[PDB]
Write a protein that binds this ligand. Structure first.
Ligand SMILES: COCCCCNC(=O)C[C@H](Cc1ccc(F)cc1)NC(=O)[C@@H](Cc1ccc(Cl)cc1Cl)NC(=O)[C@H](N)Cc1ccccc1C#N
Ligand SMILES: COCCCCNC(=O)C[C@H](Cc1ccc(F)cc1)NC(=O)[C@@H](Cc1ccc(Cl)cc1Cl)NC(=O)[C@H](N)Cc1ccccc1C#N
Lengths: 302, 302
């Protein structure tokens, strides 16, 4: 029993982290087979960052302008290219620790593990969700750029996030591993604003099912509601509308606990209307929304 | 910026996890050099578990009664011994992925990362504190026994916890890697009760300093207090007494933020007396006590 913010074991990703240096700029790269992936703003000076023309800046670079370091061993760059906002550096050595992997672009509300790195070296691992406004609430300092987010499925690592920048609000923005930003952001040093965020409704509901599975039941009630009446309450408290696809995704949890989805929605409505009144759920005093239905099934007993 | 429950990268420990089978009992083991460490109750049947005589049960075992599996490759057991509540199995192969490591016995209030495993295979990683009552609030299912907790310091893995059992309250009990239980517990299947728990005061204070470092300042006040007057309030709300050693440990955070420790204590007193009144700190609606002063310095900017 018990319920924790749980990350995937990070070893398979740790074996891929390298350091990329261009000039006086240093950040992290991802070394898979004979290619290193990193944020393209590694080629920018502090002055270039305010309004870069990346095609211009890259054409002025050659292979020997890039220093890749795997541990203390330097990797020789033999080619370089640009794909959206990621730089690809071909090296002369295939990574012998390359896991089985895929690149995936996730939807808002999905979670992933982040291996935070500095100067190519892993420092810590934590769980994140992609917020509905396409930021993540990460923990990142200067030099963390190029750290990746991932999920693992049967020894296959699915990379879904590469870290690029921190916004003025302190939240974080980045790309998929093909270099496409999540959200409307661009890789230049200007003050950029994310849209207003919302709460991930299907995840809150998943986490209420985790609580029931773990013996927290004080919030349940006998009532039920309709999808339409629930969604009126969701709008009022800045929750995402509940879709029929999300009801179906919650099927397995609903069946394991005997609590129909719309039954659990009535409990959530009461929690939104009355608060918790000093009580906690799974050790939390607010409604948690960064556990997907899959996260709950993975962590909880059957 | 940002603040997350952050675990250590788990790869170095992942390379040490094996599966140990004795009869119909299977659990996890830790393979370091040519020795496998696991909970000694692997030698117990379901009937033996109610009141075992372990010396009796072990003398009735031979090396070929133990099946160690590292991946699909079986390791041959060449010796076996008992050290307190851990079983040691000498195998004929030294683990080539053995990290630099140490065994350490931690104090209550210290944190560590847990690599939760099943059938020798790592499933997830999370952060725990050793509670003042010597339990941990883990996330563990059947088959997780033998999972270890650890910290990492400059590529040296310090193992501090091996998982043995879940108590009736759903919390978790285990040993150091020399097999000595944390707390008064014993490895038999009886209903055992932990003492009443308390809140880790020095950690709450550390986390308030993390919040200031991350720009949450709404809870600060101009007041200060004495160690003696604070400790009266600590008693009232079931917080551990604040010691002078703990004040000194908070020195670096105090200096980085300009807020003297006893100044921060006055803020905590007001938070205990008045609650948060609908506001959050570092995204939490309660006072978090599983971040040590070291955890905060490690994760936060200088
Ligand atoms: C309200 O309380 C919260 C307080 C929040 C305070 N937060 C900040 O002051 C961070 C600022 C906010 C900001 C300010 C003016 C702007 F005009 C744009 C953004 N952000 C960066 O300075 C950006 C600037 C930048 C670089 C390169 C690119 Cl492509 C894009 C940008 Cl925006 N630096 C990077 O992201 C680095 N790479 C990594 C880094 C460096 C330093 C600290 C964290 C990180 C991280 N992670
Ligand atoms: C209030 O809401 C919370 C609900 C809590 C409900 N929780 C439980 O029912 C778990 C029970 C509680 C209990 C009941 C009667 C007793 F008499 C003693 C303890 N605990 C175990 O059944 C013990 C029994 C046991 C075995 C071996 C030894 Cl040496 C010692 C013990 Cl105590 N099984 C193990 O720990 C396994 N190894 C691993 C395991 C197996 C299953 C589920 C988790 C785990 C884990 N992790």
């Amino acid at each position: 029993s018990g319920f924790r913010k749980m990350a995937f074991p990070s070893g398979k990703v740790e074996g891929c982290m390298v350091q990329v240096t261009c000039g006086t700029t240093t950040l992290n790269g991802l070394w898979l087979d004979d290619v290193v992936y990193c944020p393209r703003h590694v080629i920018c000076t502090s002055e270039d960052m305010l309004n870069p023309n990346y095609e211009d800046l890259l054409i002025r670079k050659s292979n020997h302008n890039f220093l890749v370091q795997a541990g203390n061993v330097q990797l020789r760059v033999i080619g370089h290219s640009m794909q959206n906002c990621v730089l690809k550096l071909k090296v002369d050595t295939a990574n012998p620790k390359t896991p089985k992997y895929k690149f995936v672009r996730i939807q808002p509300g999905q979670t992933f593990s982040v291996l935070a790195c500095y100067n190519g070296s892993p420092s810590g691992v934590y769980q994140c969700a992609m917020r509905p406004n396409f930021t993540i609430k990460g923990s990142f300092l200067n030099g963390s750029c190029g750290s990746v987010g991932f999920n693992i499925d049967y020894d296959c690592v699915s990379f879904c996030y590469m870290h690029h920048m921190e916004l003025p609000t302190g939240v974080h923005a980045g790309t998929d591993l093909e270099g496409n930003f999540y959200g409307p952001f661009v890789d230049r040093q200007t003050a950029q604003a994310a849209g207003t965020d919302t709460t991930i409704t299907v995840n809150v509901l998943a986490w209420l099912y985790a609580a029931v599975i773990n013996g927290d039941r004080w919030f349940l009630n006998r009532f039920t509601t309709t999808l339409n009446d629930f969604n009126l309450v969701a709008m009022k408290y800045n929750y995402e509308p509940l879709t029929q696809d999300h009801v179906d995704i919650l099927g397995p949890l609903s069946a394991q606990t005997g609590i129909a989805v719309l039954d659990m929605c009535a409990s959530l409505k009461e929690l939104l209307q009355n608060g918790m009144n000093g009580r906690t759920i799974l050790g939390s005093a607010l409604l948690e929304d960064e556990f997907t239905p899959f996260d709950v099934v993975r962590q909880c007993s059957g």
